[PDB]
């Protein structure tokens, strides 16, 4: 049996199941156990429920009573979840409620609640994460595990409605932070799979997911502080107070120690004083704004974002919002007779207005970000008004999104791609841009020489979209080879991160393997199975087949 098949098989059956979760009356305790925070208030597990969800409140109370052994506390959240409140529950952390489906005893008619199912990114975790869940949904759909993927769409709808945004993960201490947005596409691909228009259930889901997406776009991404009104582009600029509690106790000690010493106190004491707004240190308040912004960017961390992130209008975010605008334009044209009225503010929009927003975004991005010379869309700093020159694998999100001109795609493929394409796929950024590594300045995980699943997946699809499928094959081969070599040599371990230079795997890594194979014919599968590295494999082909890999 061929290792590419053993791994395919394992991912598609056993790993997704090992990675499935579903909240019922008996496990709520297990799932809510949190160790990331250690205070008296954290010793007991806890679940926070929104203010307008009484059945759900009843449910988790019932759960707490059926297993008093656990000491499961259950609080209601405020209708208005402010940053100050969120800080106020740092010492009493909790799991957040998520979507729940209704079952009914078909002869008695008694109502029951059971969690819509989801997947976690690794065997270690129990929470629903954000962007990881779109990639996993793609993977799950291929395994005909559509219900788990749909559950996640169900959950993101719920999160946007009750917590105001899609969350990094469904815990009290993440309430002020989001993730890169993929709801429109996530909802479209689950919808194609359940049947499309011919499925009343699917159309209802599509609608709920687009009401939500429009609310997310208007209230989170093009709003508040995250919008830079000058450019019209958006930043990862979450609200939030004080020190993120969930982190390693000592995580921030080296940056904090000088401040504590400037103020004549110990570190413990300085923490407290900061976290009660009693320090007036501007450049420390800024540093935590960027740290929050990093965590919201999903790229934790990289030198692209260290000490800048929340002033950057990223190609990352602004590509994804382009996608939002296009997808919403179609949705309104096709399922709202071309007039959508937002029920929350009675604002009335047409597909043409949405397309126009997209059009404008495209010009705005091109203007501030595009560099015809190198072939990269660079992030734009919005505080100092100046372009970046960090060469990121996220430049491909512009193909994925569909916002790049054909001339732009050519230039990126010809001149940018070679600076990112390493032995095992796309590195998250180039060697040049990472800079020199030292003990002062150590290796960050989302930089060269590392390559990440999501970056591959988005690029594969982006290039396929602009007619570069032949390049996707080459890139896929490189990634799949490297994953397959690892699996063989490390005695069955699938790994979190790869340098392109356990029993569960990892969500988007697993999904990357299955998505990658769809591009690979029999021959390529056999060579991958024989652990033949790309240079050798390509070199063995007749030049007609070598053209399938654009070589």
Swiss-Prot record:
Catalytic-site annotation from UniProt: 300 (proton donor/acceptor), 496 (proton donor/acceptor)
Positions contributing to substrate binding: 124, 131-132, 168, 177-179, 246, 295, 298
Primary residence: cytoplasm
Required cofactor names: Ca(2+)
GO molecular function, a single term: trehalase activity
Activity regulation behaviour: Activated by calcium. Activated by protein kinase A (PKA)-mediated phosphorylation.
Result for mutant: residue 300 to A: Abolishes catalytic activity
Knockout or disruption consequences: Increases cellular trehalase level during thermal stress. Increases sensitivity to heat shock. Decreases growth on the non-fermentable carbon source glycerol; simultaneous knockout of ATH1 exacerbates the effect.
One cellular component (GO) term of this entry: cytoplasm
Any Gene Ontology biological process: cellular response to desiccation
Catalysed reactions, as listed in the record: alpha,alpha-trehalose + H2O = alpha-D-glucose + beta-D-glucose
Entry's EC annotation: 3.2.1.28
Top-level taxon of origin: Eukaryota
Impact after mutating residue 496 to A: Abolishes catalytic activity
UniProt pathway annotation: Carbohydrate degradation
Alphabetized UniProt keyword annotations: Acetylation, Calcium, Cytoplasm, Glycosidase, Hydrolase, Metal-binding, Phosphoprotein
Triggers of expression: Induced during thermal stress (at protein level). Induced by oxidative stress (hydrogen peroxide, sodium arsenite) (at protein level). Induced by copper stress (at protein level). Induced by protein synthesis inhibitor (cycloheximide).
Family classification: Belongs to the glycosyl hydrolase 37 family.
Other notes: Present with 1840 molecules/cell in log phase SD medium.
Function description: Hydrolyzes intracellular trehalose to glucose. The disaccharide trehalose serves as a storage carbohydrate that is mobilized during nutrient stress. Regulates the level of trehalose as a protectant for cell integrity during heat stress.
Stated name of the protein: Cytosolic neutral trehalase
Lineage, highest ranks first: Eukaryota, Fungi, Dikarya, Ascomycota, Saccharomycotina
Name of encoding gene: NTH1
């Amino acid at each position: 049996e061929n290792p590419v098949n053993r791994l395919s098989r394992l991912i598609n059956t056993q790993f997704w199941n090992s990675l499935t979760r579903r909240v019922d009356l008996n496990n709520v305790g297990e799932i809510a156990k949190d160790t990331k925070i250690d205070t008296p208030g954290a010793k007991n597990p806890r679940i926070y429920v929104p203010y307008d969800c009484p059945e759900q409140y009843e449910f988790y109370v019932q759960a707490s009573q059926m297993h008093p052994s656990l000491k499961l506390e259950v609080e209601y959240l405020p209708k208005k979840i402010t940053a100050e409140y969120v800080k106020s529950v740092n010492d009493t952390p909790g799991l957040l409620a998520l979507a729940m489906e209704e079952h009914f005893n078909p002869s008695t008619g008694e109502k029951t609640l059971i969690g819509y199912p989801y997947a976690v990114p690794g065997g270690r975790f129990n929470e629903l994460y954000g962007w990881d869940s779109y990639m996993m949904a793609l993977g799950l759909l291929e395994a005909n595990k559509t219900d788990v993927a749909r559950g996640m769409v169900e959950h993101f709808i719920f999160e946007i409605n009750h917590y105001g945004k899609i969350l990094n993960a469904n815990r009290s201490y993440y309430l002020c932070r989001s993730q890169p947005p993929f709801l429109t596409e996530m909802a479209l691909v689950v919808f194609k799979k359940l049947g499309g228009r011919s499925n009343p259930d699917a159309v209802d889901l599509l609608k709920r997911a687009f009401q939500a997406s429009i609310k997310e776009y208007k209230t989170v991404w093009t709003a508040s502080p995250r919008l830079d009104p000058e450019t019209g582009l958006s930043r990862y600029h979450p609200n939030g107070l004080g020190i993120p509690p969930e982190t390693e106790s000592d995580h921030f000690d080296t940056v904090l120690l000088p401040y504590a010493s400037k103020h004549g106190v110990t570190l413990d004491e300085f923490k407290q004083l900061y976290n009660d707004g009693k320090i007036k240190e501007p450049k420390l308040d800024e540093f935590f704004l960027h740290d929050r912004g990093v965590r919201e960017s999903g790229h934790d961390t990289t030198y692209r974002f260290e000490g800048v992130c929340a002033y950057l209008a990223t190609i990352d975010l602004n590509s994804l919002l382009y996608k939002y605008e296009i997808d919403i334009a179609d949705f309104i044209k096709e399922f709202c007779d071309d007039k959508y009225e937002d029920p929350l503010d009675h604002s009335i929009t047409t597909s043409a207005m949405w397309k126009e927003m997209a059009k404008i975004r495209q010009e705005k991005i091109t203007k501030y970000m595009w560099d015809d010379e190198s072939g990269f869309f660079f992030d734009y700093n919005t505080k100092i008004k100046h372009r970046t020159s960090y060469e990121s694998a996220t430049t491909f999100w512009a193909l994925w999104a569909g916002l790049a001109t054909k001339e732009q795609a050519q230039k990126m493929v010809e001149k940018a791609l070679p600076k990112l394409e390493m032995l095992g796929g796309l590195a998250a950024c180039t060697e040049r841009s990472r800079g020199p590594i030292s003990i002062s300045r150590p290796i960050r995980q989302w930089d060269y020489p590392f390559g990440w699943a999501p970056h591959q997946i988005l690029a594969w699809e982006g290039l396929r979209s602009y007619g570069y499928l032949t390049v996707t094959n080459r890139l896929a081969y490189r990634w799949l080879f490297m994953m397959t070599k690892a699996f063989v040599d490390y005695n069955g371990i699938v790994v979190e991160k790869y340098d392109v230079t356990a029993t569960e795997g990892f969500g988007w890594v697993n999904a990357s393997y299955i998505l990658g194979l769809k591009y690979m014919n029999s021959h390529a599968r056999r060579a991958l199975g024989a652990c033949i590295p790309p240079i050798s494999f390509f070199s063995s082909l007749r030049p007609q087949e070598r053209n399938l890999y654009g070589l």
